Point group: C5
Chain length 205, copies 5
């Protein structure tokens, strides 16, 4: 306890909070999705509801420490309110995202952070034809809302969405699910924005 | 990090928060809408649900800095809780507005602020006739709830709503969408209030016009 | 900015918050309603939903200032969390009231406060017969929940509810709408309570 | 204002908050219900929704003062967040209770507190037969969640629920409504727990 | 009051908060479920809703005290916000868990904590066949979201779920209900995670 209390006090009480990335100190966030369930489709409003969790990884110099000076602590758990987290947002949501897990991240001595929130998302998707053999395809982009590619870049480790925890008795079966980096331009702003495009093809079981 | 931490500490820890605009220091907020989806209509209650984002821009002297004194930082991102934001309100809403994006603004060295919240709004609109070729027209006013035209004025850069991100498989297609400055008077108060009137003409998606 | 910052600092940082009215320093709150819409009726539960705004006015000595000493500032806007507000409550609500506007009041140099929240209220009302020519009448009382007439009195400026912003394409038309001061006695307490009774007569358009 | 500000500062800024009752300093809470409406029944889930208010009374030595020393103030209103309140809980609820009134209590110079929150509760009840002449009977227990009878005892002043504000045009009429002290034993714990059992018999009007 | 105020001040005002368990100071949490009601099933989305309470027990050295030094106080009640609590999470939920009881724990002089929150959970379950004699079986895992088996281990005192408070007029009757410790591995992480698997077999009454 003593060494960890001392480490946390040294990282968080002694400086002002990290103010987020900049053009001079940019950041790369690694994203990956694990799809648990397509819970429902609403064919009268063209909304689909997914339950998933989203692995987020990044690295800050200001969260580094030497394990020898703190009892060989190599990592610790801390509330996501104590640290900066990237503002990753679904670009075609129709309701606020619901949080289904504790908001706690793991920080490692090299300054790397892992944060894996479980979420339920309603987003824009036409499910017409879901009851056929071909199924339907829907897509949603995840990216920073306010940081361009000059401050936050994104990447994936794989283009395959993890389906190994997909609920076996869902109403819908997944035919494929990919996650792919893209670059976009928007009217407000001259700078390129990065997102990961989650594309899911599914049909009634 | 160091220069930005120092800049933020100088802007926010050294004074009391900006107390908002006044008759002597009025403010102009620029509004623009980007309509993403008409999600549903309820014909039994005359409520329609929109998903959009609303570009807000304004400028304060108290957020100015000289970039040379702070490592050539020209702008930064900060939580919308750290700064004053205008109290722009839909005047015919029937539910609290739902927030669909992080509440983070960008402040620039000249004191200008950009803030672009994504929202879902339920508002008063009669959708009778939406299933015809002509469609229906609905309107909603956005303005300050508590500041008159003497403290907050509004403008748009264009009268055309941005429809280039409108969801192509929505149940409803947009025939037109405008955003226009107006002046109103209300019973409580002799002072004029300014709003931007969002007028949308739409109909059910069909196979031909 | 400077003069207003100084005024606000003098009113709010230098004293403990106003502790509310008492038997020795009673308060009169003026109420007025502006009815925007009867949104729906539920005939299976006898609940009706109104959207309105409620003008509240009161006056405290502790919010007085001399304009000459503060750059001729005659009034200012401040968050409703910074000041005391009266605990005006609907007496036959069936759900928490939903807030549809910013919670910001205007304070004037004589100590007077204006606060005009927009609300959606579900309350107890039998809509049977709403589809006839005579329509139906419903009523809801608004008053302080915890202050009797000895600490908070209420009044209206007019007995006519403002209908000049009533939604012209509502499903329901208003035949009449009044707002009237009343005195009530309740089981808990010997002291009289004051309310304003909002009576609305309406029918299907 | 001055005397009340001074009294409140003396009661709340000068000590740590009251830490709640104990085996050595037990507390008796008096409960009484005023039933306003049975709003709806759901026969597919066996849930019923009540709107009521719950009178709570208790007495602490640490809230005593001498009126002579504070301008003859005999009582005052304060936010329920400023004082300890008993953790009275419905034992068969199916949703979080909704709060329908301001959370403000009245403290009297002898240390006695009155607190009367309005609530909407969904609880477990089979409404099958509600459309007959005999109606149905349902029951819900209210008591402390975490304090046994050794720290919190309950009582009522009467076994009759107050029905004098019951909504006259409710879908349901009340045939009877009682509130009765009981003792219960639970699996977790050898100590007796006290509750007040609210028993309501009703049918369709 | 005095001795308890002093004890609480000594435990909570004098140190930084306990930072949670680590590889060097691991923790065992004991879990047990008391099932109150299966409230509803949704056969169009494969979601089932349970109301239960979850007994949690653990022990920290930093919450120890000597009763002789504090008036023979052997335990006390405190808000769950004042102490660390384990991040026990349902692994197949489809909505945020609703809290149905006060969040108050009991701390004992040996450093042991008991915490028994009431909850409503929607989780993934196919109710097809619930209207037959055989019924249906559903399962949900509860465990730490962010701590592996190296920091948090779990156990049960019994494998039988407590059914002695199960609502007798529920739409569904319970045929069996077990709670069993398991070890799992997940894609993100090489370390084993521990859960308690709640398996319920039920049918229409
Ligand atoms: N200099 C600036 O003020 C600036 C520069 C780059 N991005 C933004 C920005 C951008 C966005 C938009 C970009 C994407 C699409 C809509 C919204 N998310 C939102 N909020 C923002 F503040 C603002
Ligand atoms: N000096 C004053 O007391 C004063 C002067 C101008 N406007 C307001 C005001 C006005 C409003 C209304 C104006 C529009 C229509 C309803 C609401 N928004 C709300 N809150 C307000 F405080 C108050
Ligand atoms: N001396 C006292 O303790 C006292 C004197 C006057 N009114 C209240 C009171 C009254 C109320 C009720 C009175 C009306 C009807 C229900 C609720 N509003 C609620 N909370 C209250 F505290 C308490
Ligand atoms: N010494 C102890 O640890 C102890 C002694 C007595 N009651 C509880 C307790 C009891 C309860 C249960 C008692 C009733 C039934 C379920 C829940 N409310 C909840 N929270 C609790 F902490 C704990
Ligand atoms: N060294 C690390 O960064 C580390 C080590 C072990 N577990 C996690 C972790 C793990 C999880 C997942 C593990 C299980 C399955 C999904 C979620 N709960 C969530 N958040 C986490 F932080 C992180
Ligand atoms: C690192 O590990 C060893 C125990 O294996 C021990 O010397 C010491 O606890 C650690 N280093 C410190 C405290 O500096
Ligand atoms: C700021 O710009 C000037 C040149 O205009 C130069 O001194 C330097 O490269 C910049 N400073 C930093 C800290 O980037
Ligand atoms: C305030 O009012 C007086 C007029 O009575 C004037 O002389 C003074 O300059 C004014 N100050 C302002 C507007 O700042
Ligand atoms: C309190 O009552 C007594 C009269 O019996 C009086 O001496 C005292 O001044 C009173 N205080 C007031 C009214 O503030
Ligand atoms: C503490 O010890 C016992 C209870 O086990 C009690 O009889 C005694 O009065 C207490 N003494 C003090 C000093 O509190």
């Amino acid at each position: 306890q003593a060494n960890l209390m001392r480490l946390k006090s040294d990282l968080f009480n002694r400086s002002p909070m990290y103010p987020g990335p900049t053009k001079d100190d940019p950041l790369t966030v690694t994203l990956g999705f694990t799809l648990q369930d397509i819970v429902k489709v609403d064919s009268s409003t063209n909304e689909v509801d997914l339950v998933y969790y989203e692995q987020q990884r990044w690295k800050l110099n200001s969260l580094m420490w030497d394990p020898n000076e703190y009892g060989n602590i190599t990592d610790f758990r801390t509330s996501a309110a104590d640290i900066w987290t990237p503002d990753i947002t679904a670009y075609s949501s129709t309701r606020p995202v619901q949080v289904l897990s504790p908001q706690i991240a793991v920080v490692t001595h090299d300054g790397s952070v892992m944060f894996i929130p479980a979420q339920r998302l309603s987003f824009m998707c036409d499910p017409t034809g879901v009851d056929s053999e071909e199924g339907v395809t829907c897509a949603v982009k995840f990216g920073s809302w306010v940081y361009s590619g000059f401050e936050i870049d994104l990447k994936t480790d794989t283009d395959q969405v993890d389906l190994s925890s997909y609920y076996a008795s869902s109403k819908y079966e997944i035919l494929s699910a990919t996650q792919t980096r893209q670059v976009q331009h928007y009217s407000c702003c001259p700078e390129p924005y990065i997102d990961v495009n989650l594309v899911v093809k599914f049909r009634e079981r």
